[PDB]
C-alpha cells in the first residue's frame, strides 16, 4: 500500500539525487573544458556526454510513473518527483537531441569566435568583442566609427547564424510539446511556478515605464547637444550606437556626456583602481571579503585553484562572456571571467560571486533543490552587493573615491548614473524574452523575424540601429544569451526583486530609514552587516526546496514580487527629472523607426 511505498520512495529519491549530482558533474566538466578552450574535440566531448545524461533522464522520467507520487502525504517528496518529471530538451528523440546540441554549439562558438577588422587598419583583423570592440563602443564618441563596429559585429554574430537559429526554434518547440507545454515560452515560464507571472510583470513594467520615458527623453536631449541634430533627432528613436553599449542595454558609459550636473562629481573609479595597482585577483579577493564580512561563506580553495579570472594569452578560442559554475560535489565552484580593471567589471565580479555564494549556501540540499528559488533569485544575489559597492559611502571606505562632496547635485548625478543601468535595462530585458516567446509560440512568420526584433526594441526602448536593416539581416543572435540559448526574463525579475532585497537588507543593517535624511536608500552600504547576511543565509540555504514566495518570506517576511522598492529608490530622481524635463521643454516619446525595411 501507499504508506510502505512512500517510505521506499524517500530511499529511492535519496540515491537518485546523489546519482544525478555525480552524472551532472561529468557533464559540467566537459562543458567547462569547452567554454575554456573551444576546439572540435572538446565540442564533440561536451555534446556526447550531454546525450548520455539525457538518455539517463529519460529512464528516470519513465521510472517516476512506477511511483504513486501524486498520492503521497509529503509535500517535499511530491516536489522532488515533480522536478524529475521535467525533462526539458532531454524529452527529444536521440537523433533530435544530438542535432539540437550541435546547433547550440554552432551558435555559441560562432559568437565566441567573432573577429572584426580595425576601423583605421583593414590589415589588423583580430579584434574580438571582449575586449577590443566593447572598448570602442564604450569609449569612442566618433559616431561613424561606432556605426562601423556596430555593423561589423551584428553581421558576424547575428546574421551568420540565421539558419542555425531557425532549426533551434523548431527543436525547442518540439521539446516543449513533448513535455506538454504549448511552446518554449511556457517551458521557461514554468520555472516561476505562477500562472499569472506574465501579467504581474506587465503590471510592474507599466508602473516604471513613465520614469524610463523621462530618462530616455533627457538622454536624447543631451546627445543632441553633443552630436548635433544631423546625428540625433528630437522626435525619433535614439541611434543605439551612441549609447555606450553594443546592445544599448545599459547606458552608464555615456554618463560623462549626459550627467545632470557636469560641474559636480560623477563617480568613475576605474582610474583610481589602475593607479592603486588593482588586479583581477585583488577584485575577486575584495568580493570574497564583502561576503565574509556579512558572515557569509568564504570562497573555497578549489575556486582559487580552478577559476579563470583573466583572458588567456595563448592563441586559443574561448567564451569570454563571464559566468559562474557549480560542479555539484562539495566546494567545487568556479568563475570564468576575462576580467578587466574597471568600475563596471568590479560590479560584474560581485554579480558572479553572488552565484557562487548561492551554490555554496544550498550544496547540502538534494540535487533537484540545488538551484535558485527561481531564476531571478540567482541573478539578484550579487547585484544586491553591487548596489552597495557602487555607493559613494562604500567607495570612499576603500579609497577609490577621493575628495567627494555629497551635496544635492552630486546625489542627483549618482541616482541618474544608477538609473542609466537599472531603469534603462528593464525594457531591454523584457524585449529579449518577448521576442523569443513570440517565435516559440509561432506568432511571427519566418519572413518577418528580423523586423519583429527591431519593432520590439523600438516599441519598448525607443532605440534603433545606426543603419537600415532588413529581412536580409538577422540581428537577435548578436546578443550572447540569444546565441547561447539562455533565458533572459531572469534578469528582468532580478532588477525588480534586487531592490526588495536591498531595501530590506539596508533596513536590517540600520542603513536605511525613510524618515531620516542622513540614511537615504541610495547611499546604503551593507558591508560588515551580519544581520543582512542572516537574511541571505535564511533564504539562499533553501535553494529550490520551496516555491519562491517562501524563499522571499524567509528573507523579509514578504511573499509578493513588487515594484514598490525600485520606485522608492529612484523617487528623488523622478521628482527632479520630471521638473528638469519641463524646465528644458524636453520632448518625450518617439516616432516609429524607419530603420528596418519590411
Ligand atoms: C502528455 O500528454 C499525453 C496525452 O495527450 C500523454 O500521453 C498519454 O500518456 C498516458 C500514460 O499516462 C497513456 O495512457 C495509457 O494508454 C494505454 C493505451 O493507449 C493506447 O490507445 C490510445 C488510444 O486509445 C493511443 O493513443 C495510444 O498510442 C495507445 O495505443 C493504456 O494501455 C495504459 O493503461 C495502463 O496504465 C494505466 C495507468 O495506471 C496508473 O497507475 C497505476 C498503476 O499501478 C494505476 O493504479 C492508476 O489507476 C493509474 O491509472 C492502468 O490503469 C492500466 O491498468 C494499464 O496498465 C495507459 O492508460 C496514453 O496512451 C498517452 N497518449 C494519449 C494520446 O492519451 C503523455 O504522457 C503526456 N506527457 C507528459 C510528459 O506528461
Ligand atoms: C555577465 C552576466 N553573465 C551571465 C552568464 C549567464 C550564463 C548562463 C548559462 C551559461 C553561461 C552563462 C550571468 O552571470 O548571469 C550577464 O550576462 N548579465 C546580463 C547581460 O550582460 O546581458 C545582464 C547583466 C545584469 C548585471 C550583471 C551581469 C548580467
Ligand atoms: C585546448 O584543447 C586542446 C585539444 O582540444 C588541448 O590539446 C590543449 O591542451 C587545450 N589548450 C589549453 C591551453 O588548455
Ligand atoms: C554567523 O552565522 C552563524 C550561523 O551561520 C550565527 O550563529 C552567528 O550568530 C553569526 N555571527 C554573528 C556575529 O552574528
Ligand atoms: Zn548572473
Tab-separated table of N, CA, C and O in Angstrom, residues 21-88:
chain	number	residue	atom	x	y	z
A	21	UNK	N	23.620	14.150	-9.254
A	21	UNK	CA	24.697	15.102	-8.962
A	21	UNK	C	26.019	14.643	-9.572
A	21	UNK	O	26.745	15.438	-10.170
A	22	UNK	N	26.307	13.347	-9.445
A	22	UNK	CA	27.547	12.767	-9.949
A	22	UNK	C	27.616	12.758	-11.480
A	22	UNK	O	28.655	13.089	-12.065
A	23	UNK	N	26.511	12.382	-12.123
A	23	UNK	CA	26.415	12.395	-13.582
A	23	UNK	C	26.475	13.816	-14.156
A	23	UNK	O	27.036	14.027	-15.232
A	24	UNK	N	25.888	14.775	-13.442
A	24	UNK	CA	25.889	16.176	-13.878
A	24	UNK	C	27.281	16.805	-13.716
A	24	UNK	O	27.683	17.643	-14.526
A	25	UNK	N	28.012	16.386	-12.681
A	25	UNK	CA	29.413	16.778	-12.512
A	25	UNK	C	30.220	16.509	-13.780
A	25	UNK	O	30.943	17.388	-14.259
A	26	UNK	N	30.074	15.299	-14.323
A	26	UNK	CA	30.769	14.890	-15.544
A	26	UNK	C	30.377	15.758	-16.750
A	26	UNK	O	31.247	16.178	-17.523
A	27	UNK	N	29.080	16.026	-16.906
A	27	UNK	CA	28.606	16.902	-17.986
A	27	UNK	C	29.169	18.315	-17.832
A	27	UNK	O	29.611	18.922	-18.811
A	28	UNK	N	29.152	18.822	-16.601
A	28	UNK	CA	29.605	20.181	-16.306
A	28	UNK	C	31.104	20.352	-16.580
A	28	UNK	O	31.520	21.378	-17.116
A	29	UNK	N	31.901	19.340	-16.236
A	29	UNK	CA	33.344	19.364	-16.503
A	29	UNK	C	33.649	19.463	-17.995
A	29	UNK	O	34.532	20.222	-18.401
A	30	UNK	N	32.906	18.706	-18.804
A	30	UNK	CA	33.047	18.756	-20.258
A	30	UNK	C	32.607	20.109	-20.842
A	30	UNK	O	33.240	20.624	-21.768
A	31	UNK	N	31.529	20.669	-20.298
A	31	UNK	CA	31.041	21.988	-20.714
A	31	UNK	C	32.050	23.082	-20.354
A	31	UNK	O	32.271	24.013	-21.128
A	32	UNK	N	32.657	22.949	-19.175
A	32	UNK	CA	33.687	23.872	-18.698
A	32	UNK	C	34.933	23.822	-19.583
A	32	UNK	O	35.492	24.863	-19.927
A	33	UNK	N	35.354	22.611	-19.952
A	33	UNK	CA	36.536	22.416	-20.791
A	33	UNK	C	36.354	23.050	-22.167
A	33	UNK	O	37.297	23.603	-22.739
A	34	UNK	N	35.131	22.972	-22.685
A	34	UNK	CA	34.805	23.545	-23.983
A	34	UNK	C	34.751	25.073	-23.946
A	34	UNK	O	35.294	25.740	-24.833
A	35	UNK	N	34.088	25.614	-22.926
A	35	UNK	CA	33.973	27.064	-22.743
A	35	UNK	C	35.305	27.743	-22.461
A	35	UNK	O	35.478	28.921	-22.765
A	36	UNK	N	36.236	26.992	-21.871
A	36	UNK	CA	37.578	27.482	-21.550
A	36	UNK	C	38.535	27.316	-22.720
A	36	UNK	O	39.612	27.916	-22.736
A	37	UNK	N	38.142	26.488	-23.686
A	37	UNK	CA	39.026	26.031	-24.750
A	37	UNK	C	38.208	25.443	-25.902
A	37	UNK	O	37.983	24.232	-25.964
A	38	UNK	N	37.752	26.310	-26.803
A	38	UNK	CA	36.893	25.895	-27.911
A	38	UNK	C	37.681	25.160	-29.000
A	38	UNK	O	38.486	25.763	-29.714
A	39	UNK	N	37.446	23.853	-29.102
A	39	UNK	CA	38.016	23.020	-30.166
A	39	UNK	C	36.945	22.050	-30.668
A	39	UNK	O	35.940	21.827	-29.991
A	40	UNK	N	37.167	21.471	-31.847
A	40	UNK	CA	36.261	20.455	-32.389
A	40	UNK	C	36.174	19.228	-31.480
A	40	UNK	O	35.107	18.620	-31.349
A	41	UNK	N	37.296	18.891	-30.841
A	41	UNK	CA	37.385	17.747	-29.931
A	41	UNK	C	36.593	17.966	-28.639
A	41	UNK	O	35.875	17.070	-28.188
A	42	UNK	N	36.737	19.149	-28.044
A	42	UNK	CA	36.019	19.498	-26.821
A	42	UNK	C	34.509	19.625	-27.036
A	42	UNK	O	33.726	19.274	-26.153
A	43	UNK	N	34.117	20.133	-28.205
A	43	UNK	CA	32.709	20.230	-28.597
A	43	UNK	C	32.086	18.838	-28.674
A	43	UNK	O	31.012	18.597	-28.117
A	44	UNK	N	32.782	17.939	-29.367
A	44	UNK	CA	32.376	16.548	-29.504
A	44	UNK	C	32.228	15.885	-28.134
A	44	UNK	O	31.226	15.221	-27.879
A	45	UNK	N	33.214	16.093	-27.260
A	45	UNK	CA	33.188	15.558	-25.896
A	45	UNK	C	32.002	16.081	-25.091
A	45	UNK	O	31.301	15.303	-24.440
A	46	UNK	N	31.797	17.398	-25.131
A	46	UNK	CA	30.704	18.054	-24.406
A	46	UNK	C	29.343	17.494	-24.825
A	46	UNK	O	28.532	17.118	-23.978
A	47	UNK	N	29.112	17.440	-26.133
A	47	UNK	CA	27.831	17.010	-26.685
A	47	UNK	C	27.534	15.516	-26.508
A	47	UNK	O	26.378	15.128	-26.338
A	48	UNK	N	28.575	14.687	-26.531
A	48	UNK	CA	28.408	13.249	-26.333
A	48	UNK	C	28.029	12.909	-24.893
A	48	UNK	O	27.199	12.024	-24.660
A	49	UNK	N	28.616	13.624	-23.936
A	49	UNK	CA	28.303	13.425	-22.517
A	49	UNK	C	26.882	13.906	-22.187
A	49	UNK	O	26.174	13.272	-21.399
A	50	UNK	N	26.477	15.021	-22.797
A	50	UNK	CA	25.129	15.564	-22.612
A	50	UNK	C	24.071	14.594	-23.124
A	50	UNK	O	23.041	14.401	-22.480
A	51	UNK	N	24.341	13.993	-24.282
A	51	UNK	CA	23.468	12.985	-24.875
A	51	UNK	C	23.318	11.770	-23.956
A	51	UNK	O	22.231	11.205	-23.840
A	52	UNK	N	24.412	11.388	-23.299
A	52	UNK	CA	24.414	10.289	-22.332
A	52	UNK	C	23.552	10.612	-21.104
A	52	UNK	O	22.760	9.777	-20.659
A	53	UNK	N	23.702	11.823	-20.568
A	53	UNK	CA	22.898	12.261	-19.427
A	53	UNK	C	21.414	12.369	-19.787
A	53	UNK	O	20.557	12.013	-18.982
A	54	UNK	N	21.121	12.856	-20.990
A	54	UNK	CA	19.739	12.964	-21.474
A	54	UNK	C	19.050	11.598	-21.542
A	54	UNK	O	17.884	11.462	-21.153
A	55	UNK	N	19.780	10.595	-22.032
A	55	UNK	CA	19.289	9.222	-22.103
A	55	UNK	C	18.937	8.680	-20.715
A	55	UNK	O	17.923	7.999	-20.549
A	56	UNK	N	19.773	8.995	-19.726
A	56	UNK	CA	19.531	8.593	-18.344
A	56	UNK	C	18.310	9.304	-17.749
A	56	UNK	O	17.536	8.696	-17.007
A	57	UNK	N	18.149	10.587	-18.072
A	57	UNK	CA	16.991	11.371	-17.624
A	57	UNK	C	15.672	10.784	-18.127
A	57	UNK	O	14.686	10.742	-17.387
A	58	UNK	N	15.666	10.336	-19.382
A	58	UNK	CA	14.516	9.639	-19.970
A	58	UNK	C	14.122	8.425	-19.138
A	58	UNK	O	12.939	8.211	-18.863
A	59	UNK	N	15.125	7.640	-18.745
A	59	UNK	CA	14.930	6.461	-17.906
A	59	UNK	C	14.340	6.854	-16.546
A	59	UNK	O	13.421	6.201	-16.049
A	60	UNK	N	14.866	7.935	-15.965
A	60	UNK	CA	14.377	8.468	-14.693
A	60	UNK	C	12.908	8.900	-14.801
A	60	UNK	O	12.069	8.451	-14.019
A	61	UNK	N	12.607	9.753	-15.780
A	61	UNK	CA	11.245	10.240	-16.001
A	61	UNK	C	10.267	9.082	-16.164
A	61	UNK	O	9.161	9.118	-15.625
A	62	UNK	N	10.694	8.061	-16.905
A	62	UNK	CA	9.935	6.830	-17.069
A	62	UNK	C	9.706	6.122	-15.730
A	62	UNK	O	8.592	5.679	-15.443
A	63	UNK	N	10.756	6.033	-14.914
A	63	UNK	CA	10.681	5.372	-13.606
A	63	UNK	C	9.752	6.058	-12.598
A	63	UNK	O	9.224	5.394	-11.705
A	64	UNK	N	9.551	7.370	-12.737
A	64	UNK	CA	8.660	8.110	-11.832
A	64	UNK	C	7.205	7.633	-11.910
A	64	UNK	O	6.458	7.754	-10.935
A	65	UNK	N	6.820	7.080	-13.060
A	65	UNK	CA	5.455	6.580	-13.277
A	65	UNK	C	5.178	5.278	-12.516
A	65	UNK	O	4.029	4.839	-12.414
A	66	UNK	N	6.234	4.672	-11.978
A	66	UNK	CA	6.115	3.470	-11.155
A	66	UNK	C	5.799	3.804	-9.692
A	66	UNK	O	5.444	2.918	-8.905
A	67	UNK	N	5.923	5.084	-9.341
A	67	UNK	CA	5.575	5.580	-8.010
A	67	UNK	C	4.279	6.374	-8.063
A	67	UNK	O	4.085	7.193	-8.966
A	68	UNK	N	3.401	6.134	-7.088
A	68	UNK	CA	2.142	6.866	-6.976
A	68	UNK	C	2.374	8.216	-6.309
A	68	UNK	O	1.708	8.549	-5.326
A	69	UNK	N	3.308	9.000	-6.846
A	69	UNK	CA	3.821	10.162	-6.113
A	69	UNK	C	2.796	11.261	-5.835
A	69	UNK	O	2.856	11.903	-4.789
A	70	UNK	N	1.845	11.454	-6.746
A	70	UNK	CA	0.773	12.438	-6.546
A	70	UNK	C	-0.134	12.102	-5.353
A	70	UNK	O	-0.828	12.977	-4.835
A	71	UNK	N	-0.108	10.842	-4.919
A	71	UNK	CA	-0.914	10.380	-3.784
A	71	UNK	C	-0.224	10.524	-2.430
A	71	UNK	O	-0.830	10.237	-1.394
A	72	UNK	N	1.032	10.968	-2.429
A	72	UNK	CA	1.828	10.982	-1.197
A	72	UNK	C	1.414	12.071	-0.210
A	72	UNK	O	0.828	13.084	-0.592
A	73	UNK	N	1.726	11.841	1.062
A	73	UNK	CA	1.440	12.800	2.127
A	73	UNK	C	2.463	13.934	2.151
A	73	UNK	O	2.117	15.086	2.422
A	74	UNK	N	3.719	13.595	1.867
A	74	UNK	CA	4.826	14.547	1.962
A	74	UNK	C	4.884	15.505	0.773
A	74	UNK	O	5.123	15.087	-0.360
A	75	UNK	N	4.673	16.790	1.051
A	75	UNK	CA	4.821	17.843	0.047
A	75	UNK	C	6.235	17.866	-0.523
A	75	UNK	O	6.426	18.133	-1.709
A	76	UNK	N	7.215	17.568	0.333
A	76	UNK	CA	8.623	17.548	-0.050
A	76	UNK	C	8.931	16.447	-1.065
A	76	UNK	O	9.604	16.696	-2.066
A	77	UNK	N	8.436	15.238	-0.812
A	77	UNK	CA	8.643	14.127	-1.747
A	77	UNK	C	7.942	14.385	-3.081
A	77	UNK	O	8.520	14.151	-4.138
A	78	UNK	N	6.710	14.887	-3.022
A	78	UNK	CA	5.958	15.239	-4.231
A	78	UNK	C	6.676	16.298	-5.072
A	78	UNK	O	6.702	16.205	-6.294
A	79	UNK	N	7.261	17.294	-4.406
A	79	UNK	CA	8.000	18.358	-5.092
A	79	UNK	C	9.236	17.813	-5.826
A	79	UNK	O	9.510	18.205	-6.963
A	80	UNK	N	9.958	16.898	-5.182
A	80	UNK	CA	11.133	16.266	-5.796
A	80	UNK	C	10.767	15.433	-7.025
A	80	UNK	O	11.400	15.554	-8.079
A	81	UNK	N	9.739	14.598	-6.890
A	81	UNK	CA	9.255	13.789	-8.008
A	81	UNK	C	8.803	14.647	-9.188
A	81	UNK	O	9.090	14.323	-10.343
A	82	UNK	N	8.106	15.741	-8.890
A	82	UNK	CA	7.658	16.660	-9.934
A	82	UNK	C	8.857	17.236	-10.690
A	82	UNK	O	8.847	17.287	-11.920
A	83	UNK	N	9.894	17.635	-9.953
A	83	UNK	CA	11.135	18.124	-10.565
A	83	UNK	C	11.736	17.109	-11.544
A	83	UNK	O	12.202	17.484	-12.621
A	84	UNK	N	11.694	15.828	-11.175
A	84	UNK	CA	12.229	14.742	-12.007
A	84	UNK	C	11.403	14.428	-13.260
A	84	UNK	O	11.897	13.774	-14.182
A	85	UNK	N	10.151	14.878	-13.299
A	85	UNK	CA	9.313	14.647	-14.479
A	85	UNK	C	9.631	15.637	-15.591
A	85	UNK	O	9.311	15.393	-16.755
A	86	UNK	N	10.265	16.748	-15.227
A	86	UNK	CA	10.513	17.836	-16.165
A	86	UNK	C	11.805	17.629	-16.951
A	86	UNK	O	12.883	18.038	-16.519
A	87	UNK	N	11.668	17.008	-18.118
A	87	UNK	CA	12.801	16.569	-18.934
A	87	UNK	C	13.497	17.663	-19.739
A	87	UNK	O	14.679	17.528	-20.074
A	88	UNK	N	12.763	18.723	-20.067
A	88	UNK	CA	13.257	19.748	-20.983
A	88	UNK	C	13.658	19.139	-22.316
A	88	UNK	O	12.936	18.300	-22.870
